[model samples]
Target: RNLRDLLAPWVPDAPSRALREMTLDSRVAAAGDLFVAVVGHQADGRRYIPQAIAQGVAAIIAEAKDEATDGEIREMHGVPVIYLSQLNERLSALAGRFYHEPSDNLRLVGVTGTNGKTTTTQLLAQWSQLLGEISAVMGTVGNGLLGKVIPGSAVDVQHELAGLVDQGATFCAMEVSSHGLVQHRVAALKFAASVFTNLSGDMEHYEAAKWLLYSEHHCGQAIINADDEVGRRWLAKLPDAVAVSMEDHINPNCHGRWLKATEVNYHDSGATIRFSSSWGDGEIESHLMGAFNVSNLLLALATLLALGYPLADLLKTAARLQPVCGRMEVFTAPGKPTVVVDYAHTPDALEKALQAARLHCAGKLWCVFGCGGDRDKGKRPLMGAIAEEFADVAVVTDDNPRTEEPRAIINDILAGMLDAGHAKVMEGRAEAVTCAVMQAKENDVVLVAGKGHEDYQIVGNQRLDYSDRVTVARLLGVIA
Candidate 1:
């Protein structure tokens, strides 16, 4: 009983309820389940303990209150309550042991950061799989053994890793978002190596969350993006972490194994990147577009090299690799507008995507995007300004305007534009995309930003089925 063997490592006397499944959600708390109760942004899991117990849950493991005192506060109810203060990381440790220590069986790499995780994570997966490992991807596209990604929610980290091990996945590349890191999702994971993508220092919690991945957690061989200030700062502290850069940011004094991209030629088809590393030097032909994607490839290259993958083998397989879906994912139709679908919700992301799209556009450029409702209101106008400045046309439309008026979000965006009257405002995102595609000339490039790979739309509390790639492709009369 993995559960029985370690459930009381933080507290004692609770025996095996033999939890059939573990969950953080109280609503779906099932009988013979381990209900993990942790405080969310606007929620305290302690408030939902009653229903969790009511559902006959095997037990409730909660994050002890702010003034945390660790112990089992229940005895008479039989559905014991475990209030472990540092349960975030501590419980993750327990989970790994309980899952038969699945992480040790699989060569897992944990990737973190705000922007490039998906692209970098996919590269790691693609490169590893090419080397004959049955690889997997764990990120926004959800989790899965390659060729069959799954919804990794409901099940915690170790539980999910356990299944991947059983499936014989020798290598897995997973994205650990700030939410996943802070929520204590993968704290106990014994990564084959941990990779960090760049961080532009977006916010307080966001930056801190990035730090926690390296400083306070189990990061096996750390590979950091030296191009970023935060990444460089991190490199300065770690004695053995590998530093990868394209911007000549590697300091010789860091005194560790490192890699750097010397030159990159961006073309319509992809990029030709030249790089040098402590392991060796080589050039890779990348099907992934844009300069930033080149950075992603370099980061992935360094990660594998750190893990002992041969550079010659990696460069040989690099040509077969393609762009991550929904991340600057390009779609071209015969004599029609070339459209790009990207998940660029932030100001910097939007600006960078627009700049990248500019590289391939021989004619006018079109930007069709909108901000997600109920998040970082300040960035909406900035995105609008970027779209206005970069693209010839700006079609501001709804982007998962959950519980907020679509027009209101649009207004926030238009506020940033120097010429608000020049923008095309519409409620339907599909219609906006259609407008851009149909109106654009053959040489013109159109970009559909935000909600890149997401196949569903969130309006109010409901998630409706929707997809920008499918919608854009259907309009262009081509398959995505």
Candidate 2:
């Protein structure tokens, strides 16, 4: 790559120079590599120029916020050193240029929110792959070509996409974090469509951070969840944005594209969603569990629809869209209450899990959960309040009470409840799950949460042999 071509948009007078790889850290700067230095929150890049130069870097791009004037060029050790203002903000565009803007060459969909980012991203990638595109996904689950995720700066993101493009990828789905947006990690990628799942918690400045993806970036099509108040406000402002809902939050008079679930059936296996959209009415037999997953699937459907994917094709391939989350594990047996095992440690997750469980419950919703010791105490009471409000039976029990008394953690969780006396305080986790399983009726749904997929329990640094799936299977007599 030529330096003049790479920096042409920002610097007209950049001298022509051959470049090999692009690196952020000075330690990795090598011969024929373009070393980008920026004054980050943690460390100043200017302090490492001498070292980068020593490592034989081809050229250097330094942040001019305080070091030098923007667009200023100087020579150090016979190598060009160009400075740019707010280089961190410009890093994405700069990286995109070096990588030939891979997003522009592919159908890139970015999904953002506090929860379901991973699930939604995977679904988007998988659904598109089924529709004849060589799809890739980059996010919490992994980053790679579809089915090969082994899983970055703004540069790291671009480089990964560039790799996918090199492998003949035609579509990519990515998870966008609030921090990534605020930090300008994806500022320059040309998204074919941008998706917003429901905002889960009050992670201070979260809404403003998430809004940057649509507001400041090149989000070609906006697909947002209309059920969330924040998502609805965003949808109302962006007239071209597509609104998706499980509930009937979408207004017919919004003057924009919309998709809503007219009806849904949640059985022991999965949800059968019947939805109508501006694109067309279609029915999806989703193999994923819970109501939240239905919402995730709908968001993916709306996004693909907005991107011009045929509705008939999506419905045809809907049955192949498997569950991405092992966290929402369900188990049952003859004459036993339907039990859901999940790693719902946070207040929002606990609430969402309970809400999902409630959809399949005919009798009552039972919650057997506890908070982790030696962690943030703020969420303990919040989880307690959700259990009290959402579950008919709230059984507070031990969940990795490392170094802290089991009673203390239970007390903290109960503090958030309207009536703490209403909760059944059980000291042992296995016993709590057993109690819920034995006492609850067959029609009831018991949620054994906080330790989904975990194989051990922590107690003051010792990992004791404990597994939620195994325990629930034993209680339901499903284990051999």
Candidate 3:
């Protein structure tokens, strides 16, 4: 695309220069590339215009401010500079145009919330593929076609989707983070559906930010969790949304489609779910654990149903649906206790993980977890109280004690417990996990929380190799 055509929507007198690639970073700028210089939190990209021009960029687009007296077009080192007001807000839209609006080429569903975004997005991709459509995912776990995901960036979002489209992907499921949404990361992409898993703290502001996807960005359809309090309120306001719930009862008089679990059997393996929806009734033996997972499954179900996937086809392949890697990922051995690795770092997630572990636990419940160093000291004691109240044994250990004294962090955790005597203090995370797994009886359930799918531990400025899943698997003699 030519620079004039690319910037036609935002800039009227954009120069007619052929553009090769688009980038925001001056370091990556090449000859014939369009360099967008916007004011970021850390540094202003506008300051790098000279460098970008030196690198042989075709044209430059910088964020406009009052101090710059020049008009839209300026000559910088023989390169055209086009200035625009509120460049950050329009970046996504501009990128979308350059990418040929890839979202419109594929059915895109965005899952947003505090916790379940990753799982829900994965499930959507998995289920869509089962229905014979080439599906792709973009989220926390990573982004790509199913089973092969690489970490993605905001620019990667549009570029990857365009790549997926070119590779014959008919559908895509993306996790729209709060920061991503607020920063206009997905501003211009058209969504086939937008899902709400649930919000964490600060319901009002966070909810408003999420609401912008639908209100301002024109999110196609709203598939929300009716069980969440915020979701219920959103349901009331959105007459056309599809409400999904595992526990909360959906009113028959509601305006739009709804799905609710009629019966759920939480087994040692996973949960067998029987749910009734506006489409029809069906049963699924999901290979995922926890009530939260059941909720995640139902959200996926509701979303597919809303997307016009046949109910019978979904149920036929539901059993094949597997659990995500780190969120409540369970490992078992013939003669050992069941060990679960989950990324439950916060107070609410920790409480949920323990409660979920309890359902599969027959003997005793053990929680092996700790707070991260130099971040959110407030949640430390709260996690402590949760472990004390929920699990039979609480093993406090190090979790990326980056620069902070590990013992000091553990002490803060102990402060919340009425009696720290019952809790075991183990400084080494691997040893802590090993101790919990070895000590627990065959029927007991052990939870290795806080760093779920992550493979590294940040100690000071270095990231050491570490993985709870690998630790549990090796300890159980399942995998080396």
Model 2 TM-score (2 dp): 0.85
Residues 91-167 of candidate 3 have per-residue lDDT tens digits of 78888888889999999999988888988999999999999989999887677888778773356578888988988
Best by TM-score: 2
Between prediction 1 and prediction 2, the one with superior lDDT is: 2
Model 1: per-residue Cα lDDT over 366-450, one tens digit each: 9999988987798988999999998999999999899988899999999999999999987788889889999999888898999
Q: Count the backbone clashes (under 3 Å) in each candidate.
A: 1, 0, 0
Candidate 1: residue 288 lDDT (0-100)? 73
What Cα-based lDDT does every candidate model obtain?
Answer: 0.82, 0.88, 0.88
Q: Which residue pairs in candidate 3 collide? A: none
Ranking, lDDT, top scorer first: 2, 3, 1
For TM-score, candidate 1 versus 2, the one ahead is 2
Q: Name the TM-score of candidate 1.
A: 0.73
lDDT by residue (445-480, candidate 2, tens digit) is 889889877788788889999987888888778861
Backbone clashes (count) for model 3:
0
